[PDB]
Design a protein around this ligand. Structure first.
Ligand SMILES: Cc1cc2nc3c(=O)[nH]c(=O)nc-3n(C[C@H](O)[C@H](O)[C@H](O)COP(=O)(O)OP(=O)(O)OC[C@H]3O[C@@H](n4cnc5c(N)ncnc54)[C@H](O)[C@@H]3O)c2cc1C
Length: 647
């Protein structure tokens, strides 16, 4: 109940957030019980919205739907309700309005980009009564959530999975858009470059190795301050190499201590065979004497009294000859490993790297080893899902009733303390251009776009140093996919995933994974790490060929017709994107995502914020995702409304 609401809202259910404390400075300085009441109303209200997010949740509705000691402080409830509504915590996505939108509209805002962050914010601003318009360079909305659809085929070339619903706003949006989510089975059989499979231990041993290795990386950073080596920020790749070497080293040592023992023992067997050989010389000599044989009766008794002493010693040695050799054996039969890495084991340990690079959108040498997991104390509760209906349904549903200008690429953004102007061009006819006047501009331009040195969008006035330093510092990875549409299915339906073991450590992530989750005859081969960019420079036919080759190596040549339809993404070559999403670069931190979020005041000639930023690269705890983009939009729509409503 109520407690699960605060959760689905990324909110403490017994504490007040820094924000809530600022907007309610009275309740914070005020007693406790009162607060406890606040938290309840707050929690209850979210429950109500969360229980049915397909219809607007009004103050009035929030009043009779209450317990009896609460439905009485009308004022607090209203305060709380407005707070929640303002910040996009209780009235976002696509819902039914019960009260038509005002006929006239306060301010004027221009939003650059029809991505999820764009549509999300525009949608908020529109209900806050502002005048919004969106300029999109492409001929469709969604942006980095692209959906391929031909015949009965449908696949996501962009965003593909919903990473859990526990606290994920995509849960609300999901029930609003009517989204068909299907869980992804946690099972991936790894096949080898030659065409065939991995035992099991092989996988269990490596995956184990992967984990422990990655654990070290962590231990060295936080626990040891190992992130600034030779006036340079330490990389993940770096640490992964430091680590492996010390493990490669431990192996050498053991192979040496072993070799030493084996050696010593061999030398002792030699020094014994010698002592034996030289003892028999003495023995044999007594059997020469014993044969020639009162002092002949006491002589024979003595020589045989001695010859039984030497012989009793020759047995001592024969006892060592056995106890030593015995030990000699042990060492050759139970000897340690030659390497910590087989030409194969490594080639497999790579996969787990490729996979890691695929998740991060960039090779490890580029990840700030110190900060690549600040976003982890913020993950969702639940199995990761997919959208077999096409993630494109979310943005297409949010794009309803909005003034969106497609095929309109922005070239310049001028902003002053008297207003702002946006200049764009028709991507279908450069002959015609446009000018848009507005009070505020909301930039949701991909970070890979704000990085093109020969700029695609010129700001006037250009933009402070701190803003650009952040842009230069932050990372923008790449990651692509191949779509294979087949006549029929030729792989286990029980198999959602399954990887390709790459030959070289440099080509670790080239077609290192195949998806099938598409409860249909559709296959997705992925490209991560260094292969991402590079491969974008290859004809589709050639890329497909490599795929069929890889697959034919698992089900043999004939259980694999040619695809009926095929598609290849190239998010780096795409002008409207210039990559996949952000990643914490070696010399950057979460603080940089905060800088990218900070708005810009344009004077003077007493200034007010005119240029605002939202997008997958402006949200600290949820970067590189669809929910981060959507949350960023809701964040700015609030900040903007807060600036232009009152003043
Ligand atoms: C291959 C791939 C797989 C992914 N998988 C996942 C996943 O499983 N889960 C997840 O949560 N996220 C995933 N993402 C990331 C997710 O899609 C993005 O985080 C999200 O789309 C970002 O939204 P946005 O609004 O910030 O920007 P975008 O959607 O990139 O939108 C910015 C918009 O501005 C437009 N634009 C650019 N320049 C101009 C211009 N000059 N004038 C006008 N318009 C312009 C763009 O065309 C675009 O429509 C993936 C991304 C890629 C590339």
């Amino acid at each position: 109940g109520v407690e699960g609401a605060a959760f689905q809202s990324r909110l403490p259910h017994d504490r007040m957030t820094s924000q809530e404390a600022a907007c309610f400075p009275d309740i914070i300085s005020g007693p406790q019980q009162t607060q406890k009441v606040f938290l309840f109303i707050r929690n209850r209200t979210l429950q109500l919205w969360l229980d049915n997010p397909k219809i607007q949740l009004t103050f009035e509705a929030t009043l009779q739907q209450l317990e009896a000691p609460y439905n009485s402080d009308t004022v607090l409830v209203h305060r709380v309700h407005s707070y929640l509504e303002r910040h996009g915590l209780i009235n976002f996505g696509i819902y039914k309005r019960i009260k038509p939108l005002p006929t006239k509209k306060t301010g004027k805002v221009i939003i650059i980009g029809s991505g999820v962050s764009g549509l999300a914010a525009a949608r908020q601003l529109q209900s806050f009564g502002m005048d919004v318009t969106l300029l999109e360079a492409r001929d469709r909305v969604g942006g980095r959530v692209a959906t391929f659809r031909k015949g009965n085929y449908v696949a996501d070339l962009g965003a593909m999975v919903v990473t859990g619903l526990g606290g994920n706003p995509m849960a609300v949006v999901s029930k609003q858009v009517n989204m068909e989510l299907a869980k992804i089975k946690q099972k991936c059989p790894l096949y080898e470059a030659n065409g065939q499979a991995v035992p099991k231990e092989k996988d269990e041993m490596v995956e184990q190795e992967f984990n422990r290795l990655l654990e070290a990386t962590s231990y060295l950073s936080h626990q040891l301050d190992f992130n600034v080596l030779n006036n340079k920020p330490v990389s993940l790749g770096q640490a992964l190499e430091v680590v492996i070497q010390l493990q490669e080293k431990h192996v050498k040592d053991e192979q040496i201590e072993h070799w030493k023992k084996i050696v010593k023992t061999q030398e002792e067997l030699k020094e014994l065979l010698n002592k034996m050989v030289n003892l028999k010389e003495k023995i044999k000599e007594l059997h020469q004497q014993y044969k020639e044989a009162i002092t002949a009766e006491f002589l024979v008794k003595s020589k045989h009294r001695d010859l039984t002493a030497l012989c009793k010693e020759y047995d001592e040695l024969a006892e060592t000859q056995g106890k030593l050799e015995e030990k000699l054996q042990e060492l050759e039969a139970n000897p340690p490993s030659d390497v910590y890495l087989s030409s194969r084991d490594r080639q497999i340990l790579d996969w787990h790297f490729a996979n890691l690079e695929f998740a991060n959108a960039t090779p490890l040498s580029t990840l700030s080893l110190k900060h690549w997991d600040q976003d982890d104390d913020f993950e969702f509760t639940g199995s990761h899902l997919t959208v077999r209906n096409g993630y494109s349904c979310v943005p297409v549903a949010l794009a309803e009733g909005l003034d969106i200008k497609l095929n309109t690429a922005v070239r310049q953004v001028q902003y002053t303390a008297s207003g702002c102007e946006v200049i764009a061009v028709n991507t279908r006819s450069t002959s015609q251009t446009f000018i848009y006047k507005c009070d505020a501009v909301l930039c949701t331009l991909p970070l890979g776009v704000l990085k093109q040195q020969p700029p695609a969008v010129q700001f006037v006035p250009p933009l402070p140093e701190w803003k650009t330093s952040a842009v230069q510092r932050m990372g923008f990875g790449n990651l692509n996919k191949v779509v294979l549409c087949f006549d029929r299915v030729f792989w286990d339906p029980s198999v959602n995933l399954f990887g390709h073991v790459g030959s070289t450590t440099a080509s670790r992530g080239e077609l290192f994974l195949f998806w099938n989750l598409y409860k249909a005859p559709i296959l997705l081969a992925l490209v991560a790490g260094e292969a991402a960019g590079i491969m974008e420079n290859i004809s589709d036919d050639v890329i497909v060929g490599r795929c069929l080759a890889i697959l034919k190596g698992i089900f043999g040549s004939s259980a694999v017709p040619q695809p009926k339809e095929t598609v290849v993404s190239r998010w780096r070559a795409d002008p409207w994107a210039r990559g996949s999403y952000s990643y914490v670069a070696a010399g950057s931190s979460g603080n940089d995502y905060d800088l990218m979020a900070q708005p810009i005041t344009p004077g003077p000639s007493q200034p007010i914020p005119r240029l605002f930023f939202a997008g997958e690269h402006t949200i600290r705890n949820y970067p590189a995702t669809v929910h981060g983009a959507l949350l960023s939009g809701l964040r700015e729509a609030g900040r903007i409304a807060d600036q232009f409503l009152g003043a």
